[PDB]
Structures are given as C-alpha cells and as structure tokens.
User: Fold FEIII-dicitrate-binding periplasmic lipoprotein FecB from Mycobacterium tuberculosis H37Rv.
Amino acid sequence: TQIAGAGVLGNDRKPDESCARAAAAADPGPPTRPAHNAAGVSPEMVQVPAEAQRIVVLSGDQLDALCALGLQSRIVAAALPNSSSSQPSYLGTTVHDLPGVGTRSAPDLRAIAAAHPDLILGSQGLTPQLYPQLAAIAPTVFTAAPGADWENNLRGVGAATARIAAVDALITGFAEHATQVGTKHDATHFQASIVQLTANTMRVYGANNFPASVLSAVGVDRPPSQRFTDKAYIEIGTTAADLAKSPDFSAADADIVYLSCASEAAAERAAVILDSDPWRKLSANRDNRVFVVNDQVWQTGEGMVAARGIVDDLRWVDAP
Assistant:
C-alpha cells in the first residue's frame, strides 16, 4: 500500500503476536513486594501483590509493558485514549477488547472501584492529582510521563508486578537488538525525520520524545531541524487555506522520513499534504524516501512492543 507515492511500512506486522506467549515468572519471594513510585509521588513505597489478577491500567505504555510480560489476561480494565472510543489495536485482540474506566486524562473512579482491582497502574505525568484516591481503592503505582523515559517506566511496571528480573532481561535484549540493527544498517550515517499528521497540522518531532529515544538506541541520526529538546514537536498548519500560503516544510526533510497519522481524519488528508507543493520540495520526497508508519507503534503506545515495531521500520534507513 501507499499514500501519494509514499510506501506503507508495517503491514506485515501481526498484532496478535505482540504479547509474550506466557506470563513472565515473578522474581522469587513472598506474596507481596515493595514497589517504588515515580518522583514526586507520596508515599514513595507501595506494597503490591506478587501475582495481581485484576489490574486497572491507566497509561498506554503500561498496557504495552503488561503485554511484553505476558500479563494481558490479568487486566480488568484500561483507561481509553483521550481522543478515541477504541482501545489500541497494535497489542492484539485481548487489549483491543478491554473495557474502559474513563479516559487517560479523566479516569472514572467509580468505574475503577466497581472493577475491584488488586493493582492500579497510572502515570504521574497524566493524572498527577489522582494518586491518593486511587491508592484508597487498591495498591497503586505511578510511573513517570510516557515518552522518552519509556525504559524507566517499564522498570516501574516490572517492580509493580514483581517482575524485576523479567523486565531487566527484556531491556538487555532490546538494547542488544537495537545495537545489532544499527550496526548492520550503519544507522549513524543516515538522518531520519519523524513526522505526525493531525487532522489540520503537521507535527515535526525533535530529540525529546518516545520515537526519538528509540532511534537513539539504534543510532539513527536526525537532521539539524530535529535536535531540539524543549518540547516533543513543532507544529505547522496544513489546512487547505494554510497550504495556499506556501509554508516552508523544510524542517521535515531528512535522508528518510517516517510519517504517521494521528487519526483517520488525519489519514483522509495525508495524500493532499504529500502531494502539495511544499511537501514536494523536500529532498526525501523527490527521492521516494518518505514512508507511512503506524501511529500506535511510533507515537501513542510508548512501550517495549511499540519500540520493537519502530526498530523493524528502521531497517529501511540504508535501503537503495
């Protein structure tokens, strides 16, 4: 498949192979464990079950972690993405079919209590005002905001589920894999651009965000326009009226461009943007080096499973 001559990557990925085939073994020990909350959360230490069987999950990166650990059948509910009535699909069927407990920005505490969780996982970067009320319902662990700190968030889920050694082995295995791919594809000698379309804007991502951190693990370089760290992305309007003003899209150019769509509404205008005079000026477009990628893998999942999906797409950096 393609959109306006840009080829689509990831169509052979099988979402139902995302989850580990069985639950990772807990660290040896007693039926409860001490786990640590993210910076700023009080109390620092939380007693959690070794084998939680009704987990409420409030951040997408934690859904990803639980899948990577094979714990998905223990999830009782998950907060829905803010802009969607649907759970993510890239993690497979069990996750996609999970019931909601409100949204990630506005969890429903009544619905959480009615799910009778034995463990709640959430993020200090998403609901910094909810910790005491969640902890009053069940053992609650908060990790940091999703994004560039995804490995430490996965470590936090590991401790929260008594799977410290399992997570350490996943992270070691990922680092070795990412380095192998980067070495094989000589990734340090290609600059990659990260672009996300919304319904009415183009976001150009810098060096401080989830996909940037995965590219850095592989060693893929970035164009000078994408080295900023003050915010995740810069944003340029792409409505029909905006495009008629001949905006300069050069910040999106590189040796290769990976472009995702944040929504179906964004996808419905992607071909327009890619066919526009500002986009056609880009060297990457002239050289047929623009690729459309899965937004859940690249942008909204933000855990190990998503990171593995990015690394697969990075095999194209040294392609003809």
Q: What stands out?
A: DSSP finds 13 helices and 13 strands in the chain.
